[PDB]
Each structure stands twice: as structure tokens, then as C-alpha cells.
Write a protein that binds this ligand. Structure first.
Ligand SMILES: [Mg+2]
Ligand SMILES: [Mg+2]
Lengths: 315, 315
């Protein structure tokens, strides 16, 4: 079922395990974060040139939130359709640098500005802090669109995994609060349901996701004991009503525990009459969107996500 | 229900001919065909410039098959990724001219060559002649790719409505015959099941612009009495196995009897582990993809289809 490049990568990760380094579960979070972040940086394809990269920050709810803006090669317009991007990493790892090459590629291919967000992470800042930052970043850029060289009529949100969940939740949050939400949502293999185990979650739980139960290293850092797991900030799939949510691109990986709940999310969007593009990449794994040094499928997925967003925004 | 721009079009369609009674369809051969073909030509956006346009013909199984090649602006390479395109019109109407602006835009946006095929129509050439021509056209181009300026490793098929069915069937025919098929299939609101009425088909029991009785005429022009409706050239959805079919982009219109069977086809591809992109465009009608003088959604759909194909082919 797995593509050659996928098998090859999994063999590599297996070899690394026999090298005798302590597992991620055994390390303090700050130590593990630093190590895995370098691996993530070095697992992206080489960064393509863009027209410009800009660093700054603004006042979030409880801290500075840093951003990095990427201007696409060849685009000379003042106000660009803009994707606000939330990196993955289980709300515990990842940063602007781990997804930098990916954001560069998305900008160039979409002809859209990308703004990558450095939101607070667990365990230091557990649920709901990261979601709070994600929401504040979107509201701040929306309300100050011109300052960020953004076309306020063409403001997307998106992200991979945890970041995908963040993007989905931002859309629901704006809608439920009665304010202007994103014009588009790019959900790359999002987590959408913390309350139930889908068939696909069980298939890779009777399996090897960092030796099955080192989800806890992430989960226990992020989620307070006694949090209701039907909370829509953890489980956006469980919303009562999907109407009024923005047009979407939803991508799943074939060999991924989150596959079923990703597809389920697209199904709910479609059934509510939302313009929804759904794609499944068979024979690849969770993370492939940014593991583009090793997985070519990741670059194809980058280009497809970018292409659909750009087409949506008329670029 | 329906988008505002869709309503504006229906209003125009209504506004024309407060009398007259012109929306009958008993003679779409010769003038029946000519007038409706002219209206379809006129319903397309103005043609964008492309790098080069070429007209030719080659020997089909029972006739000359004509083609128009469109070379995209900005592409210098000799051998391009190429989409072989089959116009819609129920296998009774349409031609290269009715889909000319659409093919031009597809080429430019995808950075792929488009080759539009003029296949035999019913009632002059009933089932299975139009399909045989579609299959023969792909095989000819595949086997003589370099003479068409096509990269044989990146040869797509696609079409709208009947044309979408044709593309679906070409892929299955190549697979069933044991030969190299298309690298990609672009299915724009395809007909996929003649053997059953989906929920969306049944919803339009009274008809769809044409009364059901009038739609029956088109059916009977194409399909000889006592044809088996489970014939996979009429009903590709009924294939027992979807494995080994090429990567797909499948689009449905929300307000369209063919919507449900289009999504079903994507679902069968997804479940067989084929890389499949599905999108529903809510609130628009069958034919919107080429009604781009009146429907902006058509331009967006053109762009999405072209961009996904281009992203697949690495353009
Ligand atoms: Mg880097
Ligand atoms: Mg024309």
C-alpha cells in the first residue's frame, strides 16, 4: 500500500531507532522540542526564493505573537490574497522555521502572500492558549489587513495537523462569535475529533505512532485533566451546524490515523452546502506535507493546496 | 438552492422569449444542433489568447476524427504535459467551437497543452460510436505523442458532462484492454450511471430546463432500444474494480441531477486507493464550466481544474 519513498523513509526512521538514542517520550518537552524541531527544519525541501520575507510581532492575548510574511515571486500588487498559516507539531513543537520552506513554496505556487504564525506552545502554555493565539492572529491581521499588505476580501487560514485543527477552529470561532471569518480554509490532514477513536485511529493504535501510547507526551502537555473532550476547540467535527463556514481544501494522507476524521470533516462541509475540495494522497504518511526532503508527494501536495487556494482567489 | 449569479442567468433566460416557445428540442440534428451549438459558443467567455492554435485530423475507426491543439502562453518546451479534452452535449450536440474559450483558459492556467476532440455525434452515430471515437483519439495521441508535441508520460483525459463520462470510460477501457492509460482524469460533472436514478436525479423527476420527455429524446438519439444500461461504457460507476485507474479530479455542480453519481464515482476512486480530488460547487447548474460569459463560478472551476492538473504534472 505504501509508496517506495514512504517505505524508504520509514526504514530510515527504523534505522535511527536502532542507533540507541533515547525516545522522544523520555525527554523533557523543551529538550525534545529543540531536537525534533532541528530534524523538522532539515526534513523540509531546500527553501525556494520568494520576493521578500518579513519578520515582526504584535500583542497577542497574553504575549507577543511573532509572524513571518512571505511575498510570492513575481507578484507586484500592493494588497495580496493572503494565507494565515499555523504550523503543526501537536501544539507542543514546530515553529516558523520548521515549515519555512513549505510556506515559501505555498506563496510562490499560489501567488498568495503567506503569513506563518508563531503561537504559544504546550506544555508551557496548554489548551486553550495555542488556539487563543491562533484566533487572535487572524482577528489582528483581518482588522489590520492593509498593514500586512493583505486583501481583506481574500484572507485564508490554514495549517497542517494541529495547525489544521487550529485553522478549522478559527473559522468556527469567528462564525459562532458573529464576526467576519476567513474567506477560505486550507486543512492539511487536520485533527478534528478528540472525543472518539475512528477506525483509522484504531488501525495505527494497534500500531506504532511513536510506539502507540507516546501520543501522551503531546496530549498530556496540552490538555488539562477533566477538559470536556467534546469541546469544539478540541473536536471541531462535533459542531451542530457547518453552514456559514468558509470554502475549504481538505487533504488526508492514506496511511494516517487522522485520515477518517479529516474526510469526515470534508463530508460535513459538503453536506452543509459549502464549496469543498477534498483530496486523499494514498500510500503516504502523516507529516508528508512538510517532510518534502524525503517525500516528493509532499511537494505535489504543496502545489495542489496552493493551486486550489490561488484558483479560489483568482490569482 | 442557487447562487445570485445563477439566478441572474435564469432571469435572463426567462426574460428572453416572453412568447416564442423556443425551449423545445425535437430536432437537434442539423439546425436544432446548429442553433444550440451557436448559443453554447456565445455562452462561453471571450477566448483568451494562447501561444498557438492548430487544427488537424486523423483516421478514426469509422471516420476522420478532428482535433484542435492549444499551446499555453509562456511554455517554450517542445513536449508538454497534455490534456485530451472531450466536449459535453449529451453525445448529440457540442463541438470544438462550443468549448473553445474553455480549452484556451484550461491550457493557460494549467501550463499544459489541450487537445480538444471532435468525436462522432448521435443520432447520426449512436452508442457506442462517440465512445469508440474518444477511445481511438486517446490511443492515437498516446501512440503518436511526439507528433502532437505531447509528453507521453503526462497525458491526461478530461471532459464535461457526456465528455466527463467519455474520459472516465477511456480510462477504464485502457485498463480493461491491458494497455497504458491516461496519467490523469479530469471529470467535470460527469454522467456515470445510466442504470439507476440517484437521489439527485430523482429530485428532478419533472425535468431539468428540458422536461423529462424532452430529455428522453436526447437519450434515445444516443442509445439504441434494448441496450444494456449496465454496459460500463454507459455506466462506468458500475465497474466492479476501480484499482489501476489514474489520479482524478472530479467536480460536481450543486444544483444538478448528475451531482450524486459524480460524487459516487470519486468515492469509488478514493476507496480503491486512487489519488482523487473531489469538489462540489454549490448553487450552480450543470453546464456552468463552459457558460463563462454569464457565470464567474465557471471561470473559478476552470481555474481549479487546470491548477490541480498542473500541480499533478509539476508545471
Ligand atoms: Mg529551513
Ligand atoms: Mg468562441
Amino acid at each position: 500500500m505504501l509508496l517506495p519513498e514512504t517505505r524508504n523513509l520509514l526504514d530510515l526512521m527504523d534505522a535511527a531507532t536502532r542507533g540507541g538514542r533515547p525516545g522522544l517520550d523520555t525527554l523533557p518537552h523543551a529538550v525534545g522540542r529543540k531536537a525534533v524541531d532541528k530534524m523538522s527544519e532539515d526534513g523540509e525541501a531546500d527553501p525556494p526564493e520568494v520576493a521578500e520575507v518579513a519578520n515582526g510581532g504584535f500583542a497577542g492575548p497574553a504575549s507577543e505573537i511573532r509572524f513571518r510574511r512571505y511575498r510570492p515571486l513575481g507578484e507586484a500588487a500592493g494588497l495580496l490574497p493572503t494565507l494565515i498559516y499555523y504550523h503543526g507539531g501537536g501544539f507542543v513543537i514546530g515553529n516558523i522555521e520548521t515549515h519555512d520552506s513549505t510556506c515559501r513554496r505555498l506563496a510562490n505556487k499560489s501567488r498568495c502572500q503567506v503569513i506563518s504564525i508563531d503561537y504559544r506552545l504546550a506544555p508551557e502554555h496548554p489548551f486553550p492558549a495555542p488556539i487563543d493565539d491562533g484566533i487572535a492572529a487572524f482577528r489582528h491581521i483581518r482588522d489590520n489587513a492593509e498593514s500586512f499588505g493583505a486583501d481583506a476580501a481574500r484572507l485564508a487560514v490554514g495549517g497542517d495537523s494541529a495547525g489544521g485543527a487550529m485553522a478549522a477552529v478559527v473559522c468556527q470561532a469567528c462564525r459562532d462569535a458573529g464576526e467576519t471569518g476567513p474567506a477560505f480554509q486550507m486543512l492539511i490532514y487536520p485533527a478534528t475529533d478528540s472525543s472518539r477513536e475512528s477506525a483509522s485511529r484504531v488501525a495505527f493504535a494497534e500500531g506504532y505512532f511513536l510506539s502507540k501510547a507516546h501520543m501522551d507526551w503531546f496530549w498530556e502537555a496540552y490538555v488539562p485533566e477533566d477538559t470536556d473532550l467534546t469541546d469544539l476547540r478540541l473536536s471541531p467535527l462535533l459542531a451542530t451546524d457547518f453552514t456559514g463556514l468558509p470554502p475549504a481544501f481538505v487533504l488526508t494522507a492514506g496511511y494516517d490515523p487522522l485520515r477518517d476524521e479529516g474526510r469526515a470533516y470534508a463530508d460535513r462541509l459538503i453536506e452543509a452546502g459549502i464549496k469543498t475540495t477534498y483530496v486523499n494522497y494514498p500510500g503516504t504518511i502523516h507529516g508528508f506535507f512538510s517532510l518534502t526532503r524525503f517525500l516528493s508527494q509532499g511537494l505535489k501536495a504543496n502545489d495542489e493546496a496552493a493551486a486550489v487556494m490561488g484558483a479560489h482567489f483568482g490569482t
